[PDB]
């Protein structure tokens, strides 16, 4: 079996303003095999109401998934995406930057 | 130009039970149906409002067909484990994609039917819909089998005929969304990297379809150096996002222009700080 | 709408 590591983008659906409801996205793509663990973290702690898209793939057979949750950004709160996959010795954490 | 595609993934589960099977259907960049072997319904389910118009006989048929697809992929996993001399202990993956493109004229343009095992090309129907690309000697076995059983002709009949007819049906029933372009909402941001230099980022938001080109120029000339182009990503509401950035000397921001090409834009857009 | 008969890789 070939093994491709996931590329990760963490981002909001809309431009982020404090106190305005939004959606936090972790887009994982370019990976193989399909079994992957993806969590959204609020200040290091796992968020519970996280949904994801239906598994699909690109022309080169590599998989992609969108994980997402509704959230209200604030000045203080830290958000991040935690991804684990057979290609990774440790789970990779990508922080949500406001850009980006 | 428009397209209908179905994507199928089966993952064997050696520990216990039958494989995980996930099927999804798209018109262009809009997912409209799904099946998941781990979901409760065991039905083909809708994922866009315009397919919900379809009556009970559509959903019974698609459920029957998708389950038959599920069993073919289960059997395939067994077949390929044998062909590749693998044990029963490991998890393996089969992937299959098929479908059709129509042109601006809404007439058949291209058909596809291709297959991978453990993420590597296995077999693909070629553009003529009459011949096969077998990647290795396992796939050659499948090729000789499929040529003897005239699989290409059966697929051709679907891909040139029924497939295009479904696509046309869906494009009409979903026209409010499927035949609407959403032009990118563009803007530029400015990030000071030091006293000497700045990063200009050109944003393209809320666009559909996903296909888009973002390019930077300096003084009106294509620049590749010191740029960064992210992969196009889903917003989650059916639209897409992308950005491109360029690092520039501070005070020279005005020399640089971001150029945006999209189907929803009559003439290309130009942004400047 | 799906293919009526999917071909199996082992016939």
* Inter-chain residue contact B233 with A11, CB threshold 8 Å: yes
* Inter-chain residue contact B75 with C8, CB threshold 8 Å: yes
Asked if chain C contacts chain A via 3 or more Cβ pairs within 8 Å, the reply is: no
- Sign of the Cα torsion B230, B25, B147, B143 reads positive
Helix residue ranges per DSSP H, chain B:
49-52, 56-83, 137-148, 151-157, 163-173, 175-178
Name the resolution in angstroms. Answer: 2.1
Query: Structural domains in chain B?
Result: 1-180 (3.30.500.10), 181-269 (2.60.40.10)
The architecture that CATH gives domain A1-100 is: Sandwich (2.60)
d(CA A31, CA A42): 25
Task: Nearest by CB to B65, from C2, C8, C11: name it.
Answer: C2
d(CA B120, CA A35): 17
How far is the CA of B215 from the CAs of A32, B102, B231, B250, in angstroms? 30, 29, 14, 20
Interface A-B, measured as beta-carbon pairs within 8 A, has a size of 73
- Find chain A residues with C-beta within 8 A of B120's C-beta: 2, 61
Hey, what are B130's tokens?
A: 């009459």
- Sign of the Cα torsion B35, B41, B42, B43 reads negative
Helix residue ranges per DSSP H, B161-245:
163-173, 175-178
d(CA A50, CA A65): 13
d(CA B14, CA A40): 30
Task: Nearest by CB to A55, from B9, B26, B234: name it.
Answer: B9
Is the bond preceding residue B44 a cis peptide, omega within 30 degrees? no
From C11's Cα to the closest Cα of chain B, the distance in A is 6
Asked if A10 and A95 touch (Cβ cutoff 8 Å), the reply is: yes
Query: Domain extents for chain A?
Result: 1-100
Q: How many helices (H) and strands (E) in chain C? A: 0, 0
A35 touches chain B (CB under 8 A): yes
Q: List the determination method.
A: X-ray
Chain A neighbours (≥3 Cβ pairs under 8 A) are B
Asked if chain A contacts chain B via 3 or more Cβ pairs within 8 Å, the reply is: yes
State the CB neighbour count (10 A cutoff) for residue B104.
Answer: 8
Comparing CA positions, the residue from B167, B120, B223 lying closest to residue B2 is B167
Task: Nearest by CB to C11, from B6, B78, B145: name it.
Answer: B145
* Inter-chain residue contact A55 with B93, CB threshold 8 Å: no
Task: Nearest by CB to A33, from B93, B236, B243: name it.
Answer: B93
* Inter-chain residue contact A13 with B118, CB threshold 8 Å: no
What stretches of A1-100 adopt beta strand conformation (E)?
A: 7-12, 22-31, 37-42, 45-46, 51-52, 56-57, 63-71, 79-84, 92-95
- Find chain C residues with C-beta within 8 A of B122's C-beta: 9
Largest pairwise CA distance in chain A? 46
Hey, what are B11's tokens?
A: 């993952």
In DSSP terms, which residues pair with B245 in a beta bridge? Answer: B201, B228
């Amino acid at each position: 079996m070939i093994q491709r590591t996931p590329k990760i983008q963490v981002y909001s659906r809309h431009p982020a303003e404090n106190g305005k409801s939004n959606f936090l996205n972790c887009y994982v793509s370019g990976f193989h095999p399909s079994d992957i663990e993806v969590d959204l973290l609020k200040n290091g702690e796992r968020i519970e109401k996280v949904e994801h898209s239906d598994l699909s793939f690109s022309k080169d057979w590599s998989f992609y998934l969108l994980y997402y949750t509704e959230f209200t950004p604030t000045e203080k709160d830290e958000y991040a995406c935690r991804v684990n996959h057979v290609t990774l010795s440790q789970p990779k954490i990508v922080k949500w930057d406001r850009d980006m | 130009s428009h397209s209908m595609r179905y994507f199928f993934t089966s993952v064997s589960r050696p520990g216990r039970g039958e494989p995980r099977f996930i099927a999804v259907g798209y018109v262009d960049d809009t997912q409209f149906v799904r099946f998941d072997s781990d979901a409760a319904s065991q039905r083909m389910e809708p994922r866009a409002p315009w397919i919900e118009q379809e009556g009970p006989e559509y959903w019974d048929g698609e459920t029957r067909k998708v389950k038959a697809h599920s069993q073919t992929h289960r059997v395939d996993l067994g077949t390929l484990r044998g062909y590749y001399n693998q044990s029963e202990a490991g998890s393996h993956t089969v992937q299959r994609m098929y479908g059709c493109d129509v042109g601006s004229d809404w007439r058949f343009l291209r058909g596809y039917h291709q297959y991978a095992y453990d993420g590597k090309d296995y077999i693909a129907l070629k553009e003529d819909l009459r011949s096969w690309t077998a990647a290795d000697m396992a796939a050659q076995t499948t090729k000789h089998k499929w040529e003897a059983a005239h699989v290409a002709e059966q697929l051709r009949a679907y891909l040139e005929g029924t497939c295009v007819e479904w696509l046309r049906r869906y494009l009409e029933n979903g026209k409010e969304t499927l035949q609407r372009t959403d032009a990118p909402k563009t803007h530029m941001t400015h990030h000071a990297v030091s006293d000497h230099e700045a990063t200009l980022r050109c944003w393209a938001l809320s666009f559909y379809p996903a296909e888009i080109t973002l390019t930077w120029q300096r003084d009106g000339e294509d620049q590749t150096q010191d740029t960064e182009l992210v992969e196009t990503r889903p917003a989650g509401d059916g639209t897409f996002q992308k950005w491109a950035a360029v690092v520039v000397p501070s005070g020279q921001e005005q020399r640089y222009t971001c150029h945006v090409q999209h189907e929803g834009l009559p003439k290309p857009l130009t942004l400047r700080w | 709408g799906l293919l009526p008969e999917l071909p199996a890789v082992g016939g």
